[PDB]
Amino acid sequence: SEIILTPKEQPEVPLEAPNIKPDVFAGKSIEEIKNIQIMHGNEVVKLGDFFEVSGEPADAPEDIKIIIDGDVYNTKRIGQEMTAGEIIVRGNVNMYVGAGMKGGKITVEGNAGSWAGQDMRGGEIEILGDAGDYVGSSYRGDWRGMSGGTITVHGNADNEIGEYMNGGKIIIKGDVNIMPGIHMNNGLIIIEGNVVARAGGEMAGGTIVVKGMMQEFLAGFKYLGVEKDIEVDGEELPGAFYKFEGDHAIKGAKGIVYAAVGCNGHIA
């Protein structure tokens, strides 16, 4: 059930550890888990070289709970493409945590780097601290991005959250910087704090809700008025929101930005 990884001193040259996920840990003894391959720069190494490993094995990934009992700020790709189980990180992570995720749950108790939940398909990611750029984003050049799952960031995020989103749900309880929902096609973004600029830049569909203040917005949106008591993607939101449709710089755009009335009179 519970498998404990205690990090050793983290290296300046970061680690890539896609193989830290329940799917790989399943059916392995503690000794075999120590011998799992991870990368350390341009060198292939063993997970045991940077982590103490304890706990009890299990045969199915559903029953496996990985907890990283320490800061791993310089390890990338943890939980990448995991289908089931749970990961708990008692500290910070680097980039790509849960990238390509299909199922299960990851909880990061500190900060996360960029591309957290990139190309997410299913499952849940929850980050108790701050996140970087490109939460739930796509990959370079691809027009098909995140299609399912839920990402919850309790702190702040930076740029291009939900880039090319095509499904799923992202919730930022804090503030974001610029261009949340850039090129969005489908899905739901809820920003409970503030937005600096360009919410919904070049979106074609989907829904963005901003409960705080947007300092700037975009002239390609048509203002539709005010809506109360909004139901979107199974979430009920109280209060009134200014309603915008765009981004009409894009042909056939049907995206929706909702902005809370209390702090967005200058946007109307």
Place this chain on the structure above:
Amino acid sequence: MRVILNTGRTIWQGQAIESGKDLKMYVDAAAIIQMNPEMMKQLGIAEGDNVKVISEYGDVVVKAVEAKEPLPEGMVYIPMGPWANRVIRPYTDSTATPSFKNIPVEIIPTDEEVLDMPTLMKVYGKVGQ
């Protein structure tokens, strides 16, 4: 004074880099800050006077110069180079490209001297290996 710092090219700094960045020419062309004459008056400085530029990310001393390419109100121009790059915003926003242009800085007159090219680099404190 709070101002907007913009950076980029000038033929004089282009001539200078292909002449030699070890040359005096390069300090004269790149260790400068271009200002509207009205801004120089408000700050109480003349061409040739030195300016201390401070930002969230660093600080530098540059020679004040009258902009012959007029600037918007509140903006200054430092040509690309290590002086400008003491103060501009390093973060790339996960693009790999820093924010070299349009950075809030504080400028104030100073009698300190402009650092020449090898002296400027010493602040980064290169350790041999």
Place this chain on the structure above:
Amino acid sequence: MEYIIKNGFVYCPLNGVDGEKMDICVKDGKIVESVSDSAKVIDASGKIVMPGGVDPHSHIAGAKVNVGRMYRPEDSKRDAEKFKGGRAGSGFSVPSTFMTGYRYAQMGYTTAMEAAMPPLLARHTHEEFHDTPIIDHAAYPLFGNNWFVMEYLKEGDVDACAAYASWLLRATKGYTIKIVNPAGTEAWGWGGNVHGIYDPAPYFDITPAEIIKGLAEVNEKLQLPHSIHLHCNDLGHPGNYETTLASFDVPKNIKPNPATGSRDTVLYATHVQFHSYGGTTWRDFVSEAPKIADYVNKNDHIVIDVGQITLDETTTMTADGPMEYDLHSLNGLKWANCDVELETGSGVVPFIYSARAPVPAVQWAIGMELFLLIDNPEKVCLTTDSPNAGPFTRYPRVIAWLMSNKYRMNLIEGELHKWAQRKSTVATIDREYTFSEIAQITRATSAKVLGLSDTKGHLGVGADADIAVYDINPETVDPSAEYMAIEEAFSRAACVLKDGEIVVKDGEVVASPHGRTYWVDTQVDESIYSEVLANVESKFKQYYSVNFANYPVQDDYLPKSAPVKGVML
């Protein structure tokens, strides 16, 4: 080195050998009658032996190809490799150069032609060739929208156009006169196009028909090894089959005249799948491959290649600028463009040929109809207009489809949209290609029509030692039922030799020699030649953006220059 290839079932259509068990002898990069008793042996028992494949039409080297690579990093992430003996690479649909040569080699191909080179960008094509292992190669410079060609051909001055072409083939180190959407791409320089073969370009006031006719006359006047290589107007439009058949007739009464090779056809029509469409809109879109196939059967002046849909997510890249903008308009996907001054245009768009979708379903059917309704394989070559209809890595799957009506009906009756049955006749065609007809459309027809059948496309004495051994036993395996064994076997050749040296063994690349660059050497009356070169240099001074002295490709770009002579003195 000396090699003896023993006890293989040899298929060599040019020498009329049809599965006979037979030894092939090799000496210093050539096929010879006999070798010493010390020659090292390659055991081909229970295996097929063919000449190295010869691809007459692929997009593998040049600017438009590299834009497809650069602006599709998602395509590389899909398929990235590093075989530790060799160079890293990536790209499912548009592979990098080292990956490109490895994979032609893995499937037993030893010669592949780049089909569209913008003359001003010719250095780029040749630079990418140098980083393309194994295969011998050549590049087709583009002529159908060239300012000099349009100006000379309107005045009826075909000899001056032939002098220009002679200069251009030498300056770009090119091999054939390639024509793409003649007059239409110049019309796209202002955002337009031409419709039908009698619709002139802006200003230049010359028709596609006159461009096609004049360049065919030029082609045989220069005695080039290959014929004109025609990509028709009105590509990819419902109802365009009539523009295609009309185009096919334009050069019919021009008589072939190669100085090198055995080519006996004046017209080469490329990826004809895209030119065989009926209907009037996409909603009443219907296959017209029977009429197209029937024209080819009855006519003796034309060779075609099909441009077979492989039902993949791929990348389209063409010198047909206006057509790609239309394609971007339909599917909304990222679009690249490059108009090349005085010479050509180009466009790049991804396309998803989903088997579920009705239009790609009919497109797949049309190509199968072309392969199967054409009686004589000597008139057809196996192509995917790589990557336009699919990556060349899918030639084995195309082979598998042709050798097995089981494979086809399995796809027709499940996955393929119903429109493949409703809007074509593929389902009623149970013809199956034999191993001899496969070697004909993947080796012999291409080698012959390109003017290389002296040294390429056959296993006889005098040929280059370009040889493919496929681990499949025609006496023991049924191609119709075991279609997945056909596909897998043609993908990963047991043994491949390139100029007598082993370069692939059991699907693995084991050596990385550089191939030759075939280009065309022609000589024209010195007086007309000088006059044309004086005219060419005057426009360079006025209208080009580079200087005349810097334009032609320097000899440093051809480490392995292999000139082929057209008309001399």
Place this chain on the structure above:
Amino acid sequence: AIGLKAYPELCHGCGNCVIACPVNALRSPEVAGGKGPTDDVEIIMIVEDGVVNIKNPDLCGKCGTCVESCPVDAIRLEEL
């Protein structure tokens, strides 16, 4: 008299004046098409050692086109 005068210390070598000049254009097709002259030609001015350089001031008709094209007032029509 009013005549052509160069201020090379302000000059960029950008070539706008050389190309804009109709006397230059008429005499050198390369200049008319925006290139610096490569063939030997006698024209009013060229860019040499990185700056504008007057070679045949007698051919200048004082029309003013080059001046319009110079953004940094490096070539002028003034006394002498």
Place this chain on the structure above:
Amino acid sequence: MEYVKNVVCPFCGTLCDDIICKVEGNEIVGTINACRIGHSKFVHAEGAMRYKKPLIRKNGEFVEVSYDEAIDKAAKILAESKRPLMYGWSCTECEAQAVGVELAEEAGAVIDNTASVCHGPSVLALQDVGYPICTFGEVKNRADVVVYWGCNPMHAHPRHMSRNVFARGFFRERGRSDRTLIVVDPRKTDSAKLADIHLQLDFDRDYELLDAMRACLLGHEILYDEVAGVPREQIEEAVEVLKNAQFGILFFGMGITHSRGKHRNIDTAIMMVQDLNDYAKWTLIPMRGHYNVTGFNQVCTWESGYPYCVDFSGGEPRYNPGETGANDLLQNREADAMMVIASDPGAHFPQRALERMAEIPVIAIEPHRTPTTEMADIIIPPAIVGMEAEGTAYRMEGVPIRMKKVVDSDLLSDREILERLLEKVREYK
């Protein structure tokens, strides 16, 4: 004195190939047709340090070594490195860039060029939405409307306007009079002074202005009565100028890659140019900086599949700008060694990256004295491409032109230095 004609200039992406070099002895003493910058590269400035031998820092002081000793230690450093950065490339020729790709492969390195500090955001943008371009000659002979968006060619591509705007072309035989010239820049630059229309917009708001322009273009109403400091009604009048073009060209530069939004400023610019083609022929060209920055992105793309920020650590190539970019590796302290060639990140990286350069072994394949050599551990001087060494370079819109060798040099070329560096790196591994 002898005059060498048809020389290609090795400075900026204009890549002029009509330079005349004046050669005295074995030395280039003057130029014709080259602008003030190009001339400055060809000719030696008095008092300027041109390293004639390799050097190594023995703490404190630099000492002259042999080529074999310098390349020797350089190979040690890269072989032992677990995250080496191979950065620069833009001011050397394509054959050397190809060797660098193979060497980055051999060392498991990240290879990256100046695109990551330059038109990188245009690369990211074109990968997402497209790349509709043309060559210089179509502009000269067809262009009806010429826009310089966030670039200042009078100072950065000095001959760019004279060759593409003032030039008399086939369909534009009146040159400058046949073209509407537009410049978009928050400053009144010397390029803006020549414009018929100058949008002196608010800095950092191009993305907003372009959003209004495209919404207008597609028939929609512009929400606010002023955008990026530009009145609503002119947005519409400017959109009308572009729609009525017979042939329009959008030249854009660092004012739009370095500004807020970075790659997304290029993104929206590209998509507007695309959509304008339903009303008028329109195309764009990035004003790429160095004479062969474009060439590296070409070479690296065709050999590996990716244009820059290419990391071979895992054997296969991988590509993530923002992770695998020169400034990412330095500022995140990932790089444990860095090799510089034909570039000056000491002068032109931000403070935060320089602090990391202070902590790691830095190799510099460099002919002149620079802020990078002041931060370097090993200095290896080469023959300079375009003057003492030949090879292919790529102009800003992809046109390949071969750089010429005008005078001889006793120093090794970059290509030879890199081929020896690669041979030894293998000996190590």
